[PDB]
Amino acid sequence: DEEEEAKHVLQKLQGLVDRLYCFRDSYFETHSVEDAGRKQQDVQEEMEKTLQQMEEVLGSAQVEAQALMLKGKALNVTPDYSPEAEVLLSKAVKLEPELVEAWNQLGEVYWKKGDVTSAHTCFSGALTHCKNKVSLQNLSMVLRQLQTDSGDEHSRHVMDSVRQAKLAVQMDVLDGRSWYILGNAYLSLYFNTGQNPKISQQALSAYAQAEKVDRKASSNPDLHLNRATLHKYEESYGEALEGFSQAAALDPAWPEPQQREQQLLEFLSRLTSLLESKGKTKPKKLQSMLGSLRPAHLGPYQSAQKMTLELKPLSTLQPGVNSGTVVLGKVVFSLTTEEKVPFTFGLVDSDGPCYAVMVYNVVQSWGVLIGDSVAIPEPNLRHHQIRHKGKDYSFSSVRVETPLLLVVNGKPQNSSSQASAT
Secondary structure, three states, rough: OOOHHEEEHHHHHHHHHHHHHHHHOOOHHHHHHHHHHHHHHHHHHHHHHHHHHHHHHHOOOOOOOHHHHHHHHHHHOOOOOHHHHHHHHHHHHHOOOOHHHHHHHHHHHHHHOOOOHHHHHHHHHHHOOOOOOOHHHHHHHOOOOOOOOHHHHHHHHHHHHHHHHHHHHHHHOOHHHHHHHHHHHHHHHHHHHOOOOHHHHHHHHHHHHHHHHOHHHHHHHHHHHHHHHHHHHHHHHHHHHHHHHHHHHHHOHHHHHHHHHHHHHHHHHHHHHHHHHOOOOOOOHHHHHHHOOOOOOHOOOOOOOOOOOOEOOHHOOOOOOOOOOOEEEEEEEEEEOOOOOOEEEEEEEEOOOOOEEEEEOOOOOOOOOOOEEEEEEEEEEEEEEEOOOOOOEEEEEEEEOOOOHHHOOEEEHHHEEOOOOO
């Protein structure tokens, strides 16, 4: 009778915790996004109600490993680090070292505590007992975030993050959390290895696959934010702004997406003002600057093969890469960004409108000054027309993938100006 009783007690405990996690995981299936502000408090109070029921189920009965685990899991339902969960789960894994779910929960608890190393030990440890989706997901997450004094180590961890996320996805391709995690792994890979647009496409495609297979992924504020950060870097500015805004709506107490949205709007306002005013430069000063241009400022060209480029006005450029062409103008202003990339400046090569130039893959100290001549080979031109929350931003830009493509005052740029190795 004691055995059946203990099993019945465990099943009741399991149910309580499963329902608590479904309450949280499904919150936006049963609540509107207008109620997003209430989610954390509702989840906190469900947890407390759940722990109370668990305690009534247990009474003074002996607490076996699975019961310790289930209570710690319940305590770990919120974003907050729980010292009680840590104690309970640390005991569970001593009483049952093969209990994978206790190791995964204990790793998540360590992660919330800010102890990434211990988290990683837990997820790795779990995988020495059984291959399982949650350990692979968590391991992917922790790997892209391990701190290391070595750049090569970090690149290996980023690559490993993708590997583990792919293993997680393959165990269950209908799990939207796995796709989201893979998205994040690709996102880090993209930024670690010189921004190969194929890899950003793989990130975007993973996030889209998350939302496709699992409605819950559309309510993941981190998915919206992370995708928006990618859109921002690739200059899909409207989509970035919508992404930050959607992430903010899904978690109104979370500052980051609101701060990101504010910063990008501030960047776009400053940029368009400075373009329209040509850096607040009077016609006299512009004519002076434009007259200081010469033949030698064309400088260098090789396409990594020898090429002679035709000097053409910015106004004559087509959208996309303009093959066979070079532009040469004067810098009328510059604009920096919290993240230090891209370096942005305004360029004029006539009485016509000023164009923005965004230079990616640049070191912090790199730049061009007001009055510099700049030549850009085969400029990649884009026209921007952004409409967000009743405000419009329109302007045209040249996206320069690396400062090593630029000629400043007739001089090519040294290899040290580029952030990733060449």
